[PDB]
């Protein structure tokens, strides 16, 4: 009845897929957090210390947040992308400890290495993590504090919360003069509107961090200067900026068009009738007296010569999304037809210099009080401290940015982490059940975050967690580590502040990666 | 857990393979420990199930044994031989505990490699090791019972029903125990001036797979595997007092001495030198037969030429055996052993004094395989145990089953206090170590603590391999033994209690005295101290270094 | 990496089912070889040979098997033939339903094995009383009924058509190795056989063949009361163990050198002759010297004999190895030898020695064979090994038990009552072993071509009203008693099968993972 | 689920020999049963299916 020879048997799932079921798989996915988890205790704190990646392009990228770091490694394993998407959604949505939240999340499967081992399935781990989030997330909104309740100033309270993002990185020892900046940055856009892309810093090799400007204008850089250029003066008083959406050329990107003539005293009205398309639209701009004219395509060299004999300075090949940034400061709105252009239209500034930085002319709007948008430009020697420092300023910005929307005053170093512990280890006194033991796990490990703060300082954990634990028995709050005076105290009088989104997006943010892994015992890999 | 490896410094230069240094190293360490001990882990405690192992020919090994299974594995790791050989010194020592030892000092470096980045010194985690076990010492003395009011051997029949838990003999235990008990007490002997010890193995272990394990006899005497040299012998001897004969001297033809040269100047010697050869050997057999030994055990093989004579004067040869399986015969029945025949005199003789006696010798078939049972010895008493079973591989985890039971008896009755089992010292130890501690504090304090923890991986693995809560048996551990430690020694009730708790089987906590389950009180110690050299010398390693053969 | 491990570890549930799965297929090949329209088994050796059977011992020796747990259903082969011999096909096809049938749980229940083994254990004692209730003692001393029950193996071979010659060469076979208690044993059973001739003109043979002619012409090939003598050392010239290494000064010493080597000879071959022995068997080669001194005075020369014949000439004539010449007597003579004759055959020569037949010693017989080729008498010889098995349980087992698949239909109906009892968490252990019972009388359905769903029906519910005799009739697939069927078992033989079966399912249970090629 | 365990509930009816001709026949008139007396467990019967 066989067909012939023997029949071997047929393998259900297709050959060369892993397949693993029972506890081991768990564990190994755990583990597999826990080593990526290496990298980032160290991080964390002040004191952290940077990473260095190079990738297989040998490109460098050096990042102290674990957000980049998870972007430049490229991550295999199913559990391990877990960490990689806690540290990208905390960094769209808030930017801010997206390091701590990977030390929370991974220290979760840690504490449940042990309960793993009992007889207890990771199912009513799960309900003890979940009841405990619940709680955990009350108390940080019962311990923040009105700022309109004392009457305080309104720029104060930006300031000592961009000094708090301003540590771990390398701005902590220069952040005197560099506060001051992007305190001012959220200040110039919009209450209700705020966005992340006018704030955009240009990278500009060479230079010093300290030699840098803070200034409501814009800087589009520049392509090319075709013919007529460095004879304009690059410093105005008051410059009237025109901006155009239509391309000025001489048949260059325009589809090809047969012209046909059949005599010969026509084919010469033909060939200056292109030179009077050409200057009739640049004759209407000079009418409207617009003194800067900037395009997001290419500028012919007709039309440059045509601005050289009146000094209008003509820069194109501009991106869009540096267009987008000018036409906010220089009120109206930009007009693609020159025959449309009205006075309204037009943009002005007290002053207006083109220097030159870094073997590099910029062109830099000043005098502009109506101003929504703002520019920043950074120095340093190497060119991996300026990506250092745009992304140091950039999680520091957002802190003002989501302070301005919600006022509200939480704790931080240490001094949170330790009084929401103590808050669950009284209610885990009552459960009297499994959920009595996930609950003190779950309170100790939200000790992590305290612990590499002692850690990477020199100083024992163990001798700070036994003052914290007699000192947090009567009532405290804000109370927590400080570096400088190396002894533990309260942080409200160091005027140290957080804002309340960081911590209340990461316990939740923790406690999803942890009940996602904990949820899978089998991991099935094809191919 | 160890990803990226480790970037090779040029500045570093050494011969043979990289050298890894810092915590990677603490980090394989438990990884490599970790590995041996999920093997163990599922073989512990009667709900465990042991693993098998093959040997690359076809054959395979299934064993309960720790020792056995960490044996046939090879560890390339070199922290990783000190868990393989701290089996092989548990079994050869004690002789029981070898599952737990392994578990008890996995967990011993898993919680002390937590604690080295918790920046406590590895120094001060051994000191609070240390200094914990000596208090943890003091407090198995005072849990020691001493038997009392007990009706015959039932102390030591419950005591041996514990080692056979866990291995195939443990749902025939009931009838292997009385076979234990009577073995090792008639090899009772007596020496060091009026000390009393006992022989190790000296118990033969006969293989024969057929009819059932419920239905292995157990023969009042010594029995020996060996197979007749011929089969005219008669096969049973009848009457009482039958002499045997323990000699190491061979009956063979045999060549003279090789700085001998015989060189002859006449052919009329060929026939008396020839003949004298086989003569020689025949003046000492003469001897023997006319003394009237019935039979006549041998060390090397016996040649056709002298097995005439044994079977004209009804005597029944014996061939090669073991060296050490004829000095228990000897001893048992009284006879001599003998390895090389002389006397005072320059002339030789034979004494009635090295003949041996008994009540009869038998020669009994167990299936295809034949062997000797020596029933109703004289000067000592003796005893043997045919194991049956289905196949021969039951029959060799039975061996080891066997073995095991008689190192806990052995250890019982040099000790008369015993401890309870079944996680009751480990769930003591626990609480006892909890209020321990807090008095000194300071740093000590956390290590400490950590040490009365560990303890509790041999609790909780019974548990989880009985597919049952384990967290539910754990918090009734705990709820018992710590309210009960502060107990002033009037109006009773309070610390009888604490006394048992862990049974697997019905998964209540009920009477271990009742139950039968308990422990000598040698496995317990000198377990923990075992377990302790293995994990300090570990932990103190910082950096390995490895060279690369030549 | 770390030492040898990892590769692919099973663990979990599947590592149990893994072994349940491969187990079962080693009784699915040998499914079709119980009854007795059982088919056969061709196998094929790495040495080239061919073995043909139908015994389910014979099949899974052969048969190279590399897992795990799939090997310890080989040696239950063995189990059964060397302690009994009959039933090895029976236990092989329990054991393997056994896992199956009575552990599927813990893929879905999740019951500890050790919980199963703890009822298996009183199950094997419930299932050993059960057999001792419905077994009916036996006369040994009736020669009609010890023919029916040789019979019974014989049922199931290819020898049932002699199953009337076979039974007359068994039973004189056993009976004249019996000894007076009577203890028996196979050493002493001859398996030679003859190539070629017909099965009805085979017969036991009392003495021992020997397939070598006479040595010398003038040697009597016809004596009508021959006296045997063993000698175990050679007639040739002994060299010894140490060299002689003879100085030879004057050439008259050289020719006494080789002068005495004859007379050496000479005076052992006068030793001889003192009891005038009409047959000499040499254990080892024989010079042509010595045999002329012998043919002087009567005695016969034959080549030299292996050690295993040697055991079964003396038991025959009752002669006494005696090794050493001089120490021969006429006491260590053998006597009482009915006739001594030579037949030619082409492949090789054939000597026969009959016994006077007329407590002492126990007497050695051969069995002759004649079959149609090499293949078919070692078909033969293993179905007399089988059917001459069966008469030794009988005598040491006066005790008779329900053939035709009713000893384990028996013990099913009976497990089945007392599941319900019995109540408690081991009530499924206990009752499934019933079910695994009942997969032996249902084979003989399958192979038989009736419908197992009627008959067996029918047969438990005729069980316990009819009698505990009623079976599966092998050849009309019907319902009948074994009373009238006139065939029966040993109760050894079920005993085996019921405690061999058992006893290596809890060894299979107690299995947690399996690791491959860790060392040598 | 479902489907998976009707398979393993067969393996007993197959080993005792019963034709997968007759065991088609045994879940078609089984389930014809199944499904007529779901309607008379339902107490959940609702007109609304608005709020």
């Known amino acids: 009845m066989n067909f012939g020879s023997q029949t071997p048997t047929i393998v259900v799932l297709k050959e060369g897929t892993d397949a693993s079921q029972g506890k081991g798989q768990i564990i190994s996915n755990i583990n597999a957090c826990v080593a990526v988890q290496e990298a980032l205790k160290p991080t964390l704190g002040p004191l952290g210390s940077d990473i260095l990646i190079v990738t297989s392009n040998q490109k460098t990228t050096i990042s102290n947040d674990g957000a980049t770091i998870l972007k430049l490694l490229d991550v295999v394993h199913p559990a391990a992308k877990t960490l990689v998407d806690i540290s990208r959604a905390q960094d769209a949505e808030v930017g801010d400890g997206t390091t701590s939240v990977t030390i929370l999340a991974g220290e979760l499967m840690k504490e449940a290495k042990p309960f793993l081992e009992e007889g207890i399935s990771s199912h009513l781990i799960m309900k003890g993590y979940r009841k405990a989030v619940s709680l955990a997330v009350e108390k940080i909104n019962e311990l923040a504090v009105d700022i309109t309740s004392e009457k305080s100033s309104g720029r104060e309270l930006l300031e000592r919360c961009a000094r708090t993002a301003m540590s771990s990185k390398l701005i902590h020892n220069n952040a005197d003069f560099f506060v001051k900046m992007c305190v001012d940055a959220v200040l110039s856009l919009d209450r209700n509107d705020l966005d992340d892309k006018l704030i955009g810093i240009k990278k500009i090799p060479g230079g010093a961090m300290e030699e840098s400007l803070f200034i409501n204008g814009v800087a589009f850089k520049k392509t090319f200067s075709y013919a007529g250029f460095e004879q304009q003066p690059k410093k105005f008083n008051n410059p009237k900026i025109l901006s155009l959406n239509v391309e000025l050329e001489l048949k260059a990107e325009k589809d090809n068009a047969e012209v046909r003539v059949e005599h010969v005293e026509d084919y010469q009205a033909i060939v200056d009738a292109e030179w009077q398309l050409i200057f009739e639209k640049l004759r209407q701009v000079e009418e409207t007296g617009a003194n800067i004219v900037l395009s997001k395509l290419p500028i012919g060299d007709l039309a440059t010569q045509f601005f050289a004999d009146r000094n209008i300075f003509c820069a194109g090949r501009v991106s869009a999304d540096d267009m987008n940034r000018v036409i906010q400061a220089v009120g109206g709105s930009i007009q693609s037809t020159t025959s449309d252009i009205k006075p309204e239209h037009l943009g002005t500034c007290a002053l207006f210099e083109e220097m030159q930085i870094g073997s590099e002319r910029y062109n830099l709007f ?61 209610y885990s006194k009552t459960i009297a059940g499994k959920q009595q033991m996930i609950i003190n796990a779950f309170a100790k490990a939200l000790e992590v975050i305290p612990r590499q703060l002692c850690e990477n300082a020199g100083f024992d954990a163990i001798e700070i967690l036994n003052k914290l634990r007699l000192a947090h028995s009567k009532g405290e709050k804000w109370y927590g580590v400080v570096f400088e005076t190396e002894n533990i105290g309260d942080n409200f009088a160091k005027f140290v502040w957080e804002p309340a989104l960081v911590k209340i997006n990461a316990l939740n943010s923790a406690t999803e990666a942890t009940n996602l892994i904990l949820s899978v015992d089998e991991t099935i890999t094809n191919k | 857990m160890s990803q990226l490896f480790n970037n090779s410094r040029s500045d570093t230069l050494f011969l043979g393979g990289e050298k890894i240094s810092g915590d990677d190293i603490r980090n394989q360490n438990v990884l490599a420990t970790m590995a041996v001990a999920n093997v163990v882990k599922s073989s512990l405690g009667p709900v465990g199930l042991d693993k098998m192992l093959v040997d690359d020919i076809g054959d395979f090994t299934v064993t309960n044994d720790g020792a056995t299974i960490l044996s046939l594995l090879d560890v390339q790791h070199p922290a990783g031989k000190i868990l393989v050989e701290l089996a092989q010194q548990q079994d050869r020592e004690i002789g029981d505990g070898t599952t737990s030892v392994v578990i008890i000092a996995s967990e011993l470096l898993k919680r002390a490699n ?210 050490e399986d004829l000095r228990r015969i000897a001893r048992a029945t009284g006879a001599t052993l003998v390895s090389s025949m002389s006397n005072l005199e320059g002339e030789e003789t034979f ?104 303890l509790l991986i041999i609790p909780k693995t019974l548990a989880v391999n009985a597919a049952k809560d384990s967290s539910e048996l754990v918090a009734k551990l705990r709820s018992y033994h710590a309210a009960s430690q502060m107990a002033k020694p009037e109006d009773v009730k309070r610390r009888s209690y604490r006394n048992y708790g862990l049974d697997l089987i019905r998964g209540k906590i009920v009477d271990e005295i009742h139950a039968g389950v308990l422990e000598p009180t040698i496995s317990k110690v000198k377990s923990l101290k075992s377990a302790l050299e293995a994990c300090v010398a570990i932990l103190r390693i910082d950096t390995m270094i490895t060279v690369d053969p030549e | 990496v770390f030492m040898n491990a990892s590769q692919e570890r099973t663990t979990g549930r599947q590592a149990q089912i893994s072994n349940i799965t491969a187990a079962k297929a080693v009784a699915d090949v040998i499914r079709t070889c119980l009854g007795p329209k059982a088919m056969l088994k061709m196998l094929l050796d790495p040495m080239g040979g061919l073995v043909l059977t139908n015994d389910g011992h014979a099949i899974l020796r052969e048969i190279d098997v590399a897992h795990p747990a799939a090997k310890s259903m080989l040696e239950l082969s063995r189990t059964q033939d060397e302690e009994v011999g009959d039933g090895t096909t029976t236990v092989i096809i329990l054991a393997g339903e056994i896992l199956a049938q009575c552990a599927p749980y813990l893929i879905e229940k999740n019951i500890h094995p050790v919980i199963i083994i703890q009822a298996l254990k009183k199950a094997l004692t419930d299932a050993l009383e059960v057999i001792k209730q419905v077994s009916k003692p036996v006369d040994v001393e009736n020669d009609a009924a010890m023919k029916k029950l040789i019979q019974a193996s014989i049922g199931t071979k290819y020898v049932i058509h002699w199953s009337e010659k076979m039974c007359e060469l068994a039973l004189d076979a056993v009976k004249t190795v019996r000894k007076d208690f009577e203890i028996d044993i196979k050493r002493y059973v001859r398996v030679e056989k003859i190539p ?29 009361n021959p006296r045997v003598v063993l000698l175990d050392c050679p007639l040739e010239y002994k060299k010894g163990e140490s060299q002689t290494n003879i100085e030879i000064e004057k050439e008259e010493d050289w020719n006494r050198i080789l002068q005495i080597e004859e007379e050496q000879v000479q005076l052992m071959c006068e030793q001889i002759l003192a009891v005038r022995p009409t047959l000499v068997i040499t254990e080892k080669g024989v010079s042509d010297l010595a045999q002329h001194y012998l043919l002087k005075g009567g005695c016969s020369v034959l080549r030299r004999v292996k050690k295993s014949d040697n055991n079964r000439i003396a038991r025959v004539t009752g002669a006494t190895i005696v090794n050493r010449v001089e120490d021969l007597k006429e006491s260590d003579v053998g006597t009482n030898c009915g006739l001594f004759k030579v037949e030619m055959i082409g492949d090789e020569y054939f000597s026969f020695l009959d016994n006077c037949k007329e407590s002492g010693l126990q007497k050695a017989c051969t069995i002759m064979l004649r079959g149609g ?72 359905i399958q192979n038989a071509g009736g419908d197992p769903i009627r008959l067996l029906s029918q047969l438990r519910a005729k069980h316990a009203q009819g009698n505990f005799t009623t079976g599966i009739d092998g050849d009309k697939g019907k319902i009948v008693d074994m009373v009238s069927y006139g065939i029966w078992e040993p109760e050894v033989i079920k005993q085996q099968s019921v405690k061999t079966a058992i006893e290596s399912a809890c060894l299979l249970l107690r299995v947690d993972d399996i690791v491959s090629g860790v060392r040598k | 689920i479902l489907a998976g365990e009707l398979l393993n509930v067969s393996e007993k009816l197959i080993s005792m020999g019963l034709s997968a001709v007759e065991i088609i026949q045994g879940y078609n008139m089984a389930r014809k049963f199944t499904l007529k007396e779901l309607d008379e467990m339902v107490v959940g019967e609702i007109t609304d299916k608005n709020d």
């Open chain 3, 373 to 444: 080729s090499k293949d078919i008498l070692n078909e033969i010889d293993r179905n007399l090994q089988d059917a001459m098995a069966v008469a030794r349980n009988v005598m040491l087992s006066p005790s008779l038990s329900p053939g035709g698949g009713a000893t384990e239909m028996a013990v099913s109906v009976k497990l089945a009552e007392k599941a319900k009892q019995l109540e408690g968490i081991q009530q499924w252990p206990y009752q499934a072993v019933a079910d695994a019972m009942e997969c032996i009388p249902r084979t003989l």
């Open chain 1, 366 to 426: 000043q005098g502009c009080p109506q101003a929504k948008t703002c520019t920043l430009l950074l120095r340093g020697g190497a060119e991996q401290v300026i990506a250092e420092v745009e992304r140091s300023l950039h999680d520091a910005i957002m802190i003002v940015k989501r302070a301005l929307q919600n006022k509200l005053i939480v704790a931080g170093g240490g001094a949170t982490e330790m009084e929401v512990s103590k808050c669950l280890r009284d």
């Open chain 2, 351 to 454: 004494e009635s004094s090295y003949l041996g006696l008994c009540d009869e010798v038998v020669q009994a078939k167990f299936s295809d395989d034949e062997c000797i049972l020596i029933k109703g010895t004289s000067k000592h008493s003796s005893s043997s145990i045919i194991l049956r079973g289905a196949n021969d591989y039951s029959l060799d985890e039975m061996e080891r089953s066997l073995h095991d039971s008689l190192s806990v008896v052995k250890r019982t009755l040099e000790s008369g206090n015993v401890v309870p089992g079944g996680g009751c010292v480990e769930a003591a130890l626990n609480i006892y170590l909890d209020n321990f501690a807090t008095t000194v504090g300071s740093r000590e304090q956390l290590a400490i603590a950590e040490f009365a923890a560990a």
């Open chain 3, 196 to 224: 070629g001739g017909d099965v009805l003109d085979s017969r036991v043979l009392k003495g021992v063949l020997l397939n070598k002619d006479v040595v010398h012409p003038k040697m009597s090939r016809h004596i009508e």
């Open chain 2, 114 to 323: 937590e604690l080295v980045k918790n920046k406590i010194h590895p120094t001060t985690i051994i000191t609070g090791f240390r200094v914990a076990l000596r208090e943890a010492i003091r407090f198995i003395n005072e849990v020691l019972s001493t038997s009392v009011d007990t009706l015959g051997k039932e102390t030591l029949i419950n005591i041996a029903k514990t080692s056979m838990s866990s291995k195939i003999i443990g749902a025939d235990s009931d009838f292997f125990s009385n076979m234990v008990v009577d073995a090792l007490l008639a090899v009772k002997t007596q020496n060091s001036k009026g000390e009393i010890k006992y022989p190790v193995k000296a118990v033969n272990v006969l293989k024969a797979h057929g009819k059932s394990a419920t239905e292995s006899l157990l023969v009042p005497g010594y029995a020996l595997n060996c197979t007749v040299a011929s089969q005219a012998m008669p096969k049973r001897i009848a009457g009482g007092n039958v002499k045997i004969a323990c000699l190491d001297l061979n009956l063979q033809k045999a060549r003279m001495a090789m700085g001998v040269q015989i060189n002859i100047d006449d052919p009329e010697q060929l026939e008396q030198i020839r003949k004298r050869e086989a003569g020689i050997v025949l003046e000492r057999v003469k001897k023997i037969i006319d003394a009237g030994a019935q039979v006549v055990l041998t060390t090397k093989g016996i040649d056709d030429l002298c097995l005439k004579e044994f079977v004209e004067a009804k005597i029944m040869g014996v061939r090669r055996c073991k060296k």
